[PDB]
Structures are given as structure tokens and as C-alpha cells.
Design a binder for this molecule. Sequence first.
Ligand SMILES: [Mg+2]
Ligand SMILES: [Mg+2]
Ligand SMILES: [Mg+2]
Ligand SMILES: [Mg+2]
Ligand SMILES: [Mn+2]
Ligand SMILES: [Mn+2]
Ligand SMILES: [Mn+2]
Ligand SMILES: [Mn+2]
Lengths: 386, 386, 386, 386
Amino acid sequence: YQPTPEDRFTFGLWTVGWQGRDPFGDATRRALDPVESVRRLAELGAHGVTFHDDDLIPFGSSDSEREEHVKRFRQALDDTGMKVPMATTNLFTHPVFKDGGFTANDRDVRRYALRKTIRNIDLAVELGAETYVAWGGREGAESGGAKDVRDALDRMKEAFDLLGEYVTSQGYDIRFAIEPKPNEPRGDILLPTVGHALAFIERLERPELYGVNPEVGHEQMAGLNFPHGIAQALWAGKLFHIDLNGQNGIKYDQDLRFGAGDLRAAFWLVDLLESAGYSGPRHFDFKPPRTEDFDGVWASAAGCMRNYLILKERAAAFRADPEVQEALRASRLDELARPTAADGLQALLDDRSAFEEFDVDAAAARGMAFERLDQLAMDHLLGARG
Amino acid sequence: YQPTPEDRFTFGLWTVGWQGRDPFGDATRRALDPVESVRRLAELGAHGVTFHDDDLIPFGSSDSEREEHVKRFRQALDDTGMKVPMATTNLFTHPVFKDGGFTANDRDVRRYALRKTIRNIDLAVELGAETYVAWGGREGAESGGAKDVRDALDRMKEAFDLLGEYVTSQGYDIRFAIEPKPNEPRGDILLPTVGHALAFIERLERPELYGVNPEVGHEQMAGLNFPHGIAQALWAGKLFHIDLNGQNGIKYDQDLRFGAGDLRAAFWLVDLLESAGYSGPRHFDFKPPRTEDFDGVWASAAGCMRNYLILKERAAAFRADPEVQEALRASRLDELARPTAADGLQALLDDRSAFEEFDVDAAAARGMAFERLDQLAMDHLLGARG
Amino acid sequence: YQPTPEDRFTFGLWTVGWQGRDPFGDATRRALDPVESVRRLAELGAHGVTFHDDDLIPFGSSDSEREEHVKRFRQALDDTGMKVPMATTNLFTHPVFKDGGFTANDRDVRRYALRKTIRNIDLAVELGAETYVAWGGREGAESGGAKDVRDALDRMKEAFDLLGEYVTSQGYDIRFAIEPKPNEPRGDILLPTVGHALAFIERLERPELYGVNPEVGHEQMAGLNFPHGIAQALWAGKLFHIDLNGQNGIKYDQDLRFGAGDLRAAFWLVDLLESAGYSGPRHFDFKPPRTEDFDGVWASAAGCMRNYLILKERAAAFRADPEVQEALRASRLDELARPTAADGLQALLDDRSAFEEFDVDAAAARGMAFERLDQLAMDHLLGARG
Amino acid sequence: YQPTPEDRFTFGLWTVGWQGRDPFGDATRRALDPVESVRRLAELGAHGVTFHDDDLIPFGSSDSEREEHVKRFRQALDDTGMKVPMATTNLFTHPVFKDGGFTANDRDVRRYALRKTIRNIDLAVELGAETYVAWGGREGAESGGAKDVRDALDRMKEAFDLLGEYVTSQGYDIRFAIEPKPNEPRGDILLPTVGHALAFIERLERPELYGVNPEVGHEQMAGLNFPHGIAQALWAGKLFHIDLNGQNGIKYDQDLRFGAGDLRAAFWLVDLLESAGYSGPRHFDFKPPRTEDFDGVWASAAGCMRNYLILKERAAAFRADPEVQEALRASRLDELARPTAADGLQALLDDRSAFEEFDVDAAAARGMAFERLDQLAMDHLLGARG
Ligand SMILES: [Mg+2]
Ligand SMILES: [Mg+2]
Ligand SMILES: [Mg+2]
Ligand SMILES: [Mg+2]
Ligand SMILES: [Mn+2]
Ligand SMILES: [Mn+2]
Ligand SMILES: [Mn+2]
Ligand SMILES: [Mn+2]
């Protein structure tokens, strides 16, 4: 289960670089130099890195300091062959963003937020990024009166429409991906799930430029089925990117390494991504627990890729097993793929065998054989059969 | 706080008619005759009633029995002035629907499901229904392999597209509303939240015919902010109908009476619906607890309308208070309504006061005064000020 | 992974006998004759069966009908060698119990509840039961005023104290186990978790007679860590019995087959039960999904035992691996077992190396090597190493 | 609704002093000088203040700096009349505590943890503290193998037993209160709810010295009913202290101001505390949202006390209303207070009216009239009746 750059595993600078500051505790690890993360990630077999603007260029840097940070970063990429497939903006850490970026009540912060984003889009494109992610972590509210959500959605649409106008006027070959999250650090965050984000995209001026970057743990923070939500994003043609990690249920955003948390959901997710032919980055938005030294940071990053490769192998065996193929037919998964009424509304309406002569009681008695199917998947996940 | 038919309160037959059968218990109340619910609801001041097909016509009835049930129902409506503003299909109770209706793996059940729906649409329209609700309570899965969700969404789109073709070919003046629910009775239900439903509607052949019927407790079963989700449905022009009730957090679907559960969320919801001018039915999808006799059933139904009328009065006082108007300006809610960059992308890009000369530290120091605002809302909800 | 009676797997009659009636649906399966469940469970390798009174003797039966049901049941046990290690009372299904059994507000129902329990204790003992379980599924409330919880706890203590007085006066060799559940079918249930039940037991007149029967899915319905709670029950000497099944997070009580739901939690649970030497029944309180025919019912029951046997093997390999032993020492699990201050309070107070000369910064820098440990456990669970 | 020191409202230094550092953001407020919090809290009508050691004495201070901080603090108390009713230790912020204090795997950290606690107990007593709180926020684990929970409970019992030996050998008149929390900042925290803490206390060497300090939002983070859990702590004689705040359901620990979050639960809580005669501090463990300036900090602190005083008035009106007294009798709350079988086990066993001549069907038909009762409570909370 050795990872190679062909597996397209990527990592954010903020992930292995997380110092371990949490709400009740100080940092337990020293800051990594972005250049040293590039090199150690390359050694582990990573395909690329991603970044917030403020991960690479310290907030408040002059153009002269900004340029020097980009230079040393670029040389590290050239020496390693490291790709930069995705970039994003930090619109949440600085106190100025305490009520949001794009949907802050203060108009001047919103304008500032857009200028800060536009500047990092330039850098992202120059560096090779295909996807630009937006996580609106501060867009939201703790109390009901603080935020008129219709106006806030107007302001959110205004911001993304202006970003779309910017990139098309520049001729940049980049798309946007909204990363939803239901809560934390705001009591409720706008566009809280994959679904709300997908619906919002349809009201943008150029919807074709926008998709989602769903994260395993965020959907699970709402008790949702992450594979199902990924299937809906794929069905809509909107899975531009994906954040992989682990989460144990409805609580604070844990960002555990991928495979931890809900193990069966991770299996069904890999099964879907591979059998659907998803070809984008397998990105890990995770946090090595602050109990770990730097040896643990790299072991946790390596475990991310290792668990994906193991689940990939197990899912492929599950689908390739002829006992499983026969179980799928016994559950009538193949009939799910058949149009319900390709004969048309009229034909269906004049089909007495569909309602008048329908033997409802004989149909009710068929078993779906779902448990036998599910035990075969369990056996394959656990390796009790190949 | 007396309810009148002008308040547009409606109730499902299955609500006050709930006998109290729960997963671990037998019915504690006798079945109500639909005609007797119409009359007692009329006496309480209800505006109308809604129904599943199987609430009015016992499953398996002949056309002769079907017709006689509709007759006595219609006379009750004529005698009372009761409206029937919404109707829906029961595609979940009968064992034949154990793997779904529109997305059952068995093709013949899916065809049956559509014929059963189409037949009740005719009745709904003849009876005056403006909205036809679809709750896909059985569309979903307990295990990951049981359901290919991309195919299931194809089958779901096929079903609603055929319903849209039916009603437009008949010239019916009726729209559809999808009622989302995240889980129960399936482990995970398809289209689990308002957002997923809104996104799905955009891929239908005639999206203008379809909106959502959100329910207070269902969104709350995913830990979501119901007012926020209602604001997004209103923003999209898709709030066709609404289910009001109460729910205490993330657990089984309680269907408590409206006002119970999350009381502040009910206040912010009423505030939004009234200040937005929502003009559809205020429908209560609730269940009188099975501890109650028939006196408790009607007291619980009356409490639904009473709590709405009380919250309406308190929300109107909150908005009409000049101290609250001044608190709203102190929090810059009025600036949220101002376009971020109506001067355009070019102007914004050449505005040095938006990024180059932006005093980020002075902006960071502004307080949003959200707590004072929220205490004023609390005071108004509790009646510690008028 | 073949189960034998030595593995002590047991099943309730109500589990494989679940007809599939859920809150929104009718039964999808015919009722099993208790004698036929005994025989098919024996064929699968089950060690024994458990029952509610009302599973074996239909509610309202005369003594003559009661006796005949017990007779045919007993012959089935004698023919198979089937044990009856645990029994319990149904104090939740009948409408008379709609506000509770032991803590119903009506005094006459409480007296009735105790007489019904006492009668089944006699039968349980005559049949060989070592453990008598109490699940107070109706003890609780939907609304805050319905139940004075201090008085209800007085009534709960009164009931169990009287049961303890009964069994000791009869000389029965049986203990009680409280099965906690946080909610469903009541909005909130009294003694909602393992912890509350353990604390309550300490205020009974004879605490030594009472322990807990925790269920995987119930603790998980509160977002709790089930292995941790089992460790606390073992630490207190109170794990009398255990209910094994599966649950996907905070939602309705799913009662999936064991291994489904949270797979890693099931691994850590088996690891604990085996390395602690738990010798009681491995009981499955689960529900074959109502999508299944009778073939699926038995496949689901067999999967319960199969997943336990697979996790047992994987946990034993994890603990037996010398790489894991060395990882445990690297994380200082062995030092956790060392008394903190066996030298005493005085010695500790005069130890300058514990506070005055303590190098807090050097201690802060140690990594706990938890991720490497956890990846070894993952590898063992998945079978990527033996 | 003006608060006076007679109302016994207290606040932690860390509450109004919270600078607004959250997991994704930097501080938005300057640090308050402990002396300035004492004075402004006194002006608002607070009864007293509480503190962690590290709130008053910066970590790593010499005895000379430690003494000077205590001096200026004490003068502020003397000038104001401010009480210090409770104190606690910070065993979670410093990186040395990243795997726990009392249950850290490293034995030397555990010894350090006890010495740090013992030193602040001296100060607490000298300052007048009646209650010493322990929040074991770092005692726990992210992964299953990191922590043997039986050993960790041994180490937890060892620590509290040594604290009990210390305070009794010194003759201090102080008791301990464990503050439970289910998760955050560890994935799972030991003693996660009021119940687990109550059960653990019973295994300490001197249980009479230990009770609980429950927090509104922590129990609610597990979906539990906080009033019910408070009733169980009162029933056991263990409510030594209480943390009041607000929380919106199962998510990160919000620490909103009291009254926010679940408003009806706050009403039922106040109703219980007042009708039970709880006489301890009404302590607010809350966090002014980081959107606020210092005006908002004090408005949020004032709102804490204001909402308590408003709910107190409404609960007293509810109980004093003769319509509510009559509703309580209609629901048979008075019969809940009657012993079930004060006539004894023998009498109960020979009472044919309790089982043989029990009219189960007539009893099943009684309604509990819970909804009418609950609407009266709603009306009182909202002020739709006095
Ligand atoms: Mg992410
Ligand atoms: Mg509904
Ligand atoms: Mg059970
Ligand atoms: Mg606290
Ligand atoms: Mn995350
Ligand atoms: Mn509902
Ligand atoms: Mn269960
Ligand atoms: Mn808290």
C-alpha cells in the first residue's frame, strides 16, 4: 500500500502545519516552514500541496516580503515536482473577519474581503491551481437578529458573481468550489451542507464555474450520509474537489486522519469515488492530534494515504467478486438502473398491470436480500474473503 | 389570541387522527372519522384540512367505496366552509413500499407508486388543492450497497418529471412541494434537507412547478437552523408550503405541537414568515402525544394556533420597537442590505480605500452590538417590554 | 468463523421475531412461533434465548393458556439444549403503560406494574435465568411539567427495592440489570445513560443485587463512547449483561445487526470485553430490517455472531503483535497502570522533582505516539497485517 | 429585574475575560485585568467571582510575583465586598497537559498535576472558597488504544482520594465538585455526563466530600435533558454548584449567555432550582461572543442575570396559579408523590385489585392531560397570563 504521485493525494499546508492551538490550549508544536512541508510531503509520495494565502504570506506583508515568500516556495515546487492543484483564501482568522468576509454586515469589510480573495486568485493561477476553494467559515450568526439571511445570500451571490466576472475577464482556466460546513466557529454557518451549496450555485450568474468541495467530517457534523451527498454532487456534475478526513459523529470539527471516525462510511465513499471515475485530487483536510510530535505528524499524514489505498483495494474486491455481483442482482440493483416508464406517460396510464392488475401483496412479500449483501461488503472490508 | 380562518391555519387528517401507535406501543386512541375531524377543526377556527389518499379512502377500496368516502367528506367541507389547500400520497405505510415508492429497486413498484400518486392528484385538484406534497419517507437505505444513489436520483427525477408532464397535459393549476427529512423510517432518506431538495429541483424538466414543504422538526433532526433554511427557500422563490411543529434536537421525529421544542427558533421563524409576507397555509404536521385523550388532542391542536398567534404578536412588537430599530442600525443590519460593489469590478479594483488604504485594525475593533440586540429580542419574546 | 454454544451468543425472541411494524409502516413479516425461533436459533449455533413476558404469553391470557404456552416452550428448550440466561418484562407496549410502569403518575398502574414484573420473575427463575433486565422505556416525559423527577426517582427506587425484597425473601439466585436508553419512545427517558443508571443503583437498599445491561446503540444515541462506558461499568463491578447491536449516530434507535453502525467502536468493544474476561452472555438486541424476508432474518442473526467472531480474532492479533506491544510502551500505557503517588501524600508534597524541579517544557515536548499506535490497530482491523 | 448580591450571581474571571481566541481565529479583545473585572462585576450586581489559578497568577510566576498578584486581587475584593465562592485549577491549557492531568499516561505529569492543584486549594481556602471545581477537560482520548479506561479511572480515583486526604488533614472546610463534559477538546472526555460523575463519586474513599458542578451546555452537548439531570443530582444530595449558560444542541461548546440556546429548558431549570431551594451560587460559565466589544461583554454578563430573574418570576407565577395547581392534580402529579406500596410487599402481593381485579382497559383510557398543563406553562413563560 505504497502511495505514488499517480494516486493524486494532496495536503494543505495548514494540515501538517497545524501547531495544535485549540479552544482550550496553546500550541504543542513549532511552526513548519512551508518549504519543509513541501519536501517532506514529496518524500511521503504526495502529489501536491494546497494553501491559504495567509499560510504562505504572513498577514500584513509588503509586496517585497510577499514576493520573497513566493520565490522560495516556487523553488521548492520545482525541485520536487510538487503540484499546487488547489488554493483558497483565509477569510476567517483575522479579527476583521469576525462577522464574516463576503457577508459581514460592514460593507467595507466585504469590499476588503473581495480584494484579498482576488489577489490570491492571481497567485493561485500563476502557480498552477485548477480549483479555487471558498470556505465561508465566518459567514453566519450566533443569534437570530444578527443577520438577515436573505440579504446575506444577496451579498454572497454578489461576491461570487464578481469573482466569476474577474476570472472570465482575465481568461483564467480555474473553477470555484464551495466547501460547506454546518457550524463552528459560527453558531450556524450559511450554506451549511452540500445540498444548500448546490442549490445556491444554481442562482449564480455563471453556474458552470462553481461546484462543491465537500468534507467528510462536515456533512457528518449534521448527521448526514457523506457517500449519499457525494452521489448527489456527482449526479449534478458538481464534484470539483473533495476534502477527506475522519469524524466521530455530531460534535466539534475533529479533522481526524482519513479512515478514522466512521470507517464503513469511508469504505462506501472510496467505492463510490472509484466506481464513478472521480479524477480530481484526493485532498486531506485533517489535523494531526496535538498529542503528537513531528514523528506523529508524518505518521498521521502517511496513514491518510495508507487507509485510502487499503479501502480502494477492498472496494475493488467487493465489486469484482461474482458472489457480490449475484447478490446485487438478488437485491434488484440492476432494475434500479432501468427507466421506470420509458414507454411514456400514456402507456403507463393504460397499463393495467401497473395498478389495476398489480398484485400488491405478492410484491410486498419479496425480500430485498439487503443483509446478505451487506454482510458480503463487511466480509470484504474486513478481509474475511477476497 | 383567538384563531380565525383568516390566519390560514391548516391540519392534516393524520395529525389529530393519530391513534398513538409508536414503535414500542399500541394505539391509545380510537380512529377519528374524517368527517368528525373536519367539523371539530372548523369549530377551533382552522382554515382547512389536508390528507393522504389512504387517510380518506382505506387502502384497497373499490371505486364504489372510494366514491362514497369522497362524498361524505365533500359534504362536511360544504357544511363548514373548510378548504382543502394541500394533499399528498401515502407511499410509505403499506409493506409494498418497504424499499421506497419512486426509487424502489423493483421497477414494478415504482410504476405502481406513480399510478397511485396520479390518481390522488385528480382528487386533490377536484377538491381545490393548490399544493401537492411529496414526502419520500421510504426512499433511502439502511446499508451502503442497497441503493445506488445516482440511479436512485435518476429514478426520482423520472418520477417527478412524469408528474409534471401529467399535470401540465391536464391543465391543472397545482404545484408540487417536496418535504425533506434526513432519516426515519429509513436509516438515511434521499434529499435529506431543504438544501438537497432545492438543488434537486433545479435538475427537473420544469423546475418552476416544484418547491419545498419544509418541516420545523426535520431540519432540526440534522441540527440545522430552520429559520436560515426557510430564508434560503424564500430567497430562491421556492417556499410553496410549510409544516409547523416542535422538536427537541437530534433524535427521533417527535412532531410536537408548534411552539414546543426550540422556542426561540419558533420566534425567529414567525418573525421571518411575517416580515417576508409568506401567504401560504400555516400547516401543522404534528402528533398529539399518545398520553392524551381526545380532550388533549383538541387542546394540543388549539395550542398550535395559539402559540403562532402569540409569537406573531411578540415578533411584530420587536420589529415595531424604536429601540430595536436603533439597535439594528448599531449592528449595521441596514448596511448588509447595501450592494457590496455596485460601482463594479473595475471601480472596486481601483479603490485603494478597499485594500491598500484599508485600516484593517480599526475595522477589527468595531463591536457588532449583537448581544444588546439579542437581549432586546429576548425581552420582547418574554414580554419584559412592549 | 463458525459460532458454537461456547461463544455464549444469545438472542431475544422479540429480535428475530420482529415483524417490522415501525412508526410509519405496517408489519412486513409474519409472527414467528417462539418454539420455531428456539429451534432455528439452535441450528445457527446460538447459546440461548431471552424473552419478555408478553413475547411468550399473549397479554390477557388465563392461567390455563399461560401454562400451555410455557409447556411447549420448555419442550423446545429441552430438545435443543437451549439456555434461557436472561428474562425481562414488557412494561411499555400496552396502552396502560403510556405514562410509565414504575413511575407512572397513576398509583394503581405502578402497583399493577410491580405485580406483572413479580410474576415473570418466578417464571424466569424456574426457567434458569441468571439476570433479570429492566428497560424503563416509558419512564419519562415529553414536557417539563408532566413529571416531577425527584418524586419519580423515589418511585423508581421504591419499585426496585421491592423487587430486591421479593427475590431475597424467595431465595432466588438472580440479579437485576437496568438497561439505559436516553430517549424514544418518551421524549426523555429516566436514567438515560450507563452513568445515570450506575449512580442510581448506589442509592438502592441492596446495591449488590443490581447492575447494568448497556446497549451499543443507546449510548451512541447520546453521542457517547460505548467502550468507555463499558469500561466504567466493569471498573465498578456492574457489567451484569450487555446488548450488542449497531447504530449510525444520533438518531432513532436503529437496532442494526452487530458490526454495522460504528465499526471501529465495535472493534474496541470486543477488545475490551475479551481482554477483561467478561463471561456473561453476548446478547443481541437487534432488529432485522423490515426490508428482509425470513431468509434475511436468519442471515442477519448469523451476521451478528459472525462479526463478533471476526472482531475477536482481529483484536487478539492486535494485542498479540509485538509491534503493538512496543507501540503501547512508546505511548506509556504501561505507566498509566503505575500508581501516581504510592509513596503517599507527604512524600509527594516533599518531592521537589514533582513541581519545583519539574521540567514542564521537556515534558510538554514528548510525543504520545498515539497515531502510530492507532494505525497499527487500523491495520489489524482491516487485516493489512497479522 | 435588577440583580442584587442577594441573588448570588457569580462569574468566572475567564468568562468576561475571554479574549475571543477560537479554533479558527485570533483574539478580538484585549485582556482584562482581574482587578478591573472584580470592580465592573460588582457594579453590575454580581455576588462574587471565581477563578482558575492561571487566570490570576500567570503560569511560571515566582512566589514573589505570585504574592503580588494575590495582593492586588485581595484589595479589590475588600473594596467591593466581592465574595470568592468557588475556585478551580487550570489543568488543560499548557502543552504539558496535552494527554490529561490526573490521567495523563506519563506518571510525572500526574504528580505535577496534583501538586499544582494542591497549591491552588490553599489559596482558594484562604480566599473564602466553599467549593473547589475540577473540570477534567484533557482526561480522555481521540483513539481507542491511547487510554486504558479502567486504569485511567484508577488514576482518577487515586488523584481525588489524595485531594480528599489533603483537605481533611489540613482541616479545610471545602468540598469538591466535578464538572462533567462529554467531549471537546478531547474526542471523548472521561466522566462525560452528570450520571457518570455521580457514579464515580460513589467509589471514592470519602464520597461525602464530592459532588457535581453540572453545566447547562455540556449535558445538552449529549442531547440530554438538563433539568432531569439536575433533579437526579439533587435527589442524590450532590448538587454542590452549577454552571449556567446557553447551548443550541449537539455541537461545539458554545457557552452562550444564560437564557440563550434552549429557552424552555432554562425555564424548567429555574423552576426546579427555586422550588427545590437550591442555595448555592448561580454561576455563569459563559463566553461573550467574539463579535462583541467591551460594551457587549458587560451587556452579555448583565443579560445572564436578567434572564434568570425573568424566568424566576415566570416560574413562580406558574406554580402560584390556581389553574396550574388544578392542572397538576388533573395530571396526577400529586399521586406521583404517594408511595406505591407503603402497605408492603406482602399486602401488595395479596391485593387482587392490583392485578387480578385490575381494570387495565379503564386505566388505559385515562388521559394524562399533559398538553393542557404544558400550554399553561407556555402561557406563563410568554406572559400571556399572570
Ligand atoms: Mg476543508
Ligand atoms: Mg410533514
Ligand atoms: Mg435492549
Ligand atoms: Mg464550566
Ligand atoms: Mn473540518
Ligand atoms: Mn415530523
Ligand atoms: Mn435499541
Ligand atoms: Mn461549556
